[PDB]
């Protein structure tokens, strides 16, 4: 902490903070002995040899300055002595540290005040420069400055709270006052105030602060914010202030987390009345809330959440192409940019490395040709800034649309990993039709006419490899085995610019609510009464206990956040 020296020339005084080891230099100053007061504990880590280091600690904070002393006795010559007077103070900057990384790591958590608790506001609570609603303190992190000092302390000292200027645009701090008709919060630190003096009284006092983050982790922000309290010595009013003790805490800003479809749903939003009827029935069977949206939301939006030990809230993430409320967050950033090209896998363990929140998937090209499309880097960097879900890259530029979710989806399962990966498989659809022709049903209509088509086979051969390419990537990135992947029939054709398009209604990109699957209905209800595509899809999934219904197909789903605490991962 500080360095104390002694001399016979003048009496020496020092202030020591409880818990901080204070260095005392008795050597190199006019054999010696040390006799500390009963209120002071002194040890050694005497021939005035500089290698002899004396460490001071104090038992308790004092109510008066200069209450304790250490008697220094030097010793042929006349007696030589020095008088050291110590003041005991307790200063501690407290924050929620126990709740770096890991289940045994330490550090504070700070959330972005991105919701809109003020119902009359048109902006986020982080954008207002103020606290107008007491409910908003539920989202903010609590910090307490606890001091116990002599009654006359801070006559010669002052306390200053500050943050680094590089962080001044990322954090705002409020101080909570007292009174009867009000208990106002007040702005301490912010875009115009990197530091502020605290009028802390002497004796015992606790001062309370409310902290908000102003931005998510991103390219320009690793996610750590440090708050420092500085004790300055102003005993000499003719000279600049000096520093004698500092303390600080570090906050980690929680990442935005994407929720996979394997998490139990909480609310469908319906932004096609017969479709809505089936969704109402499906939502009912699944015990989900359904919200019709009569008249303020888009299908382009994605729904994530922020997790903390004190407050958890959902956050909408909105398209690059404002909808917010109390405990309902909103974040923005910035062909393949539409969030239909975003997906997140279930939790996986890959060769010993655990991904408890799964991994973020998106589609891209195989190489940067002049025509190949890409997802804007600003979004890739934003998503990668949240290390907790390690994004991966898939191949989707072969599709006319490019949305990765066009060929793959996940469903729950009762065993093994608890889920299955469903991929489009022209191989299975071909066999399905060819088997029916081989059994004598080639005259069925939506089959032998399309099986004979050479162009269709060549187009599906090209696509076949385009999909298997991702099959291998996912097995490597997610650690999947073939026994965990289900082939869903689906044929493709190439159109203008030779991009892949679905031959018949997509059998994935379905609405999944728990164990109830809102599968798009294929237009083949002519083959032997029961569409062969419907029976094949059902047969593949029925052993899993999942309930398949086909809807003759503008919506979103909010889902339960993870029970795992993201800050406990490495």
């Amino acid at each position, epitope marked *: 902490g500080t360095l104390i020296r002694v001399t016979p020339e003048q009496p020496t005084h020092a202030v020591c903070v409880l818990g901080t080891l204070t260095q005392l230099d008795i050597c190199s100053s006019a054999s010696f002995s040390i006799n500390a007061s009963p209120g002071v504990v002194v040890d050694i880590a005497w021939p005035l040899d500089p290698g002899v280091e004396v460490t001071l600690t104090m038992k308790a904070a004092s109510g008066s300055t200069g209450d304790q002393k250490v008697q220094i006795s030097y010793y042929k010559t006349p007696p030589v002595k020095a008088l050291l007077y110590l003041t005991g103070v307790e200063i501690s900057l407290c924050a929620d540290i126990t709740r770096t990384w890991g289940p045994c790591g330490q550090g504070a958590i700070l959330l972005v005040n991105c919701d809109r608790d003020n119902l009359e506001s048109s902006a986020m609570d982080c954008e207002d420069d103020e606290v*107008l609603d*007491s409910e908003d303190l539920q989202d903010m992190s609590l910090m307490t400055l606890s001091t116990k000092t002599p009654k006359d302390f801070f006559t010669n000292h002052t306390l200053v709270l500050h943050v680094a200027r590089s962080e001044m645009d990322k954090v705002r701090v409020f101080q909570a006052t007292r009174g009867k008709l009000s*208990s106002k*919060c007040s702005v301490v630190l912010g875009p115009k105030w990197p530091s502020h003096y605290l009028m802390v009284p002497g004796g015992k006092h606790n001062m309370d602060f409310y902290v908000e983050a102003l931005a998510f982790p991103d390219t320009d922000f690793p996610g750590l914010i440090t708050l420092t309290i500085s004790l300055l010595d102003t005993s000499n009013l003719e000279l600049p202030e000096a520093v004698v003790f500092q303390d600080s805490v570090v906050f980690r800003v929680a990442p935005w987390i994407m929720t996979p479809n394997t998490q139990p749903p909480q609310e469908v939003y319906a932004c096609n009345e017969d479709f809505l009827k089936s969704v109402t029935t499906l939502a009912m069977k699944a015990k989900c809330k359904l919200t019709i949206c009569p008249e303020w939301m888009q299908d382009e939006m994605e729904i994530g959440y922020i997790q903390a030990p004190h407050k958890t809230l959902p956050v909408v993430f909105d398209s690059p192409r404002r909808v917010m409320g109390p405990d309902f967050g909103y974040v923005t950033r910035g062909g393949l940019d539409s969030f239909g090209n975003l997906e997140v896998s279930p939790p996986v363990t890959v060769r010993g490395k655990e991904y408890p929140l799964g991994r973020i998937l998106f589609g891209d090209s195989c190489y940067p040709s002049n025509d190949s499309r890409q997802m804007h880097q600003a979004l890739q960097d934003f998503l990668s800034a949240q290390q907790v879900q390690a994004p991966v890259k898939l191949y989707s530029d072969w599709l006319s649309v490019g949305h990765v979710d066009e060929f793959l989806s996940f469903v729950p399962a009762p065993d093994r990993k608890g889920f299955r990966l469903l991929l489009a498989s022209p191989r299975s659809c071909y066999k399905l039709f060819q088997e029916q022709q081989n059994e004598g049903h080639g005259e069925a209509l939506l089959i032998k006419n399309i099986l004979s088509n050479k162009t269709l086979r060549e187009h599906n051969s090209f696509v076949e490899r385009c999909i298997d390419w991702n099959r291998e990537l996912l097995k490597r990135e997610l650690g999947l085995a073939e026994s965990d992947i289900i082939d869903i029939p689906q044929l493709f054709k190439l159109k203008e610019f030779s991009k892949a398009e679905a031959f018949f209604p997509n059998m994935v990109n379905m609405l999944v609510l728990g164990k109830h699957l809102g599968i798009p209905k294929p237009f083949g209800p002519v083959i032997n009464g029961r569409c062969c595509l419907e029976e094949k899809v059902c047969s593949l999934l029925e052993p899993l206990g999942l309930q398949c219904t086909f809807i003759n197909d503008g919506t979103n789903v909010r889902r339960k956040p993870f029970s795992f605490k993201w800050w406990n991962m490495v």
Partner: antibody, heavy 121, light 106 residues
């Protein structure tokens, strides 16, 4: 352990005053606090509100100038100071926290209603 | 002021009957209404906290919706414990108002 309790009622003579309080248990007192009274034979009448950590308050028109609402955030306790009480103010007085709305229309309710106090003038 | 109008003032139904209570707003309030159930001698209880937003913990027997300027509370089938006085709240401004209260009798 999560509940609101109220006290400070009793019999007062016309023209006098009473100091009602609502203490929180198991609750950090961060939410706005509301008082609602029900005279015998009548329905619910909202009285007043406070936002503790911003000092915004609101009163019903029938009690403006007569009632004052206040709170001690260090004791998680709200206070309603009723002066110049009239016979018309006889009622059972309840206290409740605000409860937030939800998408798409954010209108708000009252929750964890306490036992209320009996105010007789 | 924003006056709540409830109708009817009282109901008469038996156990197993389906009943509805309607309330009319005096202004175009943005679905911001709530429904409370008061047991005799007890504080009011919250059932619905925005139009169609059922409060957590309430049995599925209770539901309601907006219909233009009117709001409706529905009980799919009255149970022996569902007979109470119901109130409708319109928290649309700094001045909160409640309706008159509708009592459901057996």
């Amino acid at each position: 352990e999560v509940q609101l309790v109220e006290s400070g009622g009793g019999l007062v003579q016309p023209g006098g005053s009473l100091r009602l309080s609502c203490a929180a248990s198991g609750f950090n007192f961060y939410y706005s606090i509301h008082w609602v009274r029900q005279a015998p034979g009548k329905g619910l009448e909202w009285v007043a509100s406070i936002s503790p950590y911003s000092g915004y308050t609101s009163y019903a028109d029938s009690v403006k100038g007569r009632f004052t609402i206040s709170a001690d955030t260090s004791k998680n306790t709200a206070y309603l100071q009723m002066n110049s009480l009239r016979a018309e103010d006889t009622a059972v007085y309840y206290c409740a926290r605000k409860h937030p709305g939800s998408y798409p229309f954010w209108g708000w309710a009252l929750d964890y209603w306490g036992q209320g106090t009996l105010v007789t003038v | 002021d924003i006056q709540m109008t409830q109708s009817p003032s009282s109901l008469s139904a038996s156990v197993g009957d389906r009943v509805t209570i309607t309330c009319r707003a005096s202004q175009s309030v943005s679905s911001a209404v709530a429904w409370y159930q008061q047991k005799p001698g007890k504080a009011p209880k919250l059932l619905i906290y925005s139009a169609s937003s059922l409060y957590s913990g309430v049995p599925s027997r209770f539901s309601g919706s907006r219909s233009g300027t009117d709001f409706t509370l529905t009980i799919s089938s009255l149970q022996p414990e569902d007979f109470a006085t119901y109130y409708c709240q319109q928290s649309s401004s700094s001045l909160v108002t409640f309706g008159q209260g509708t009592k459901v009798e057996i």
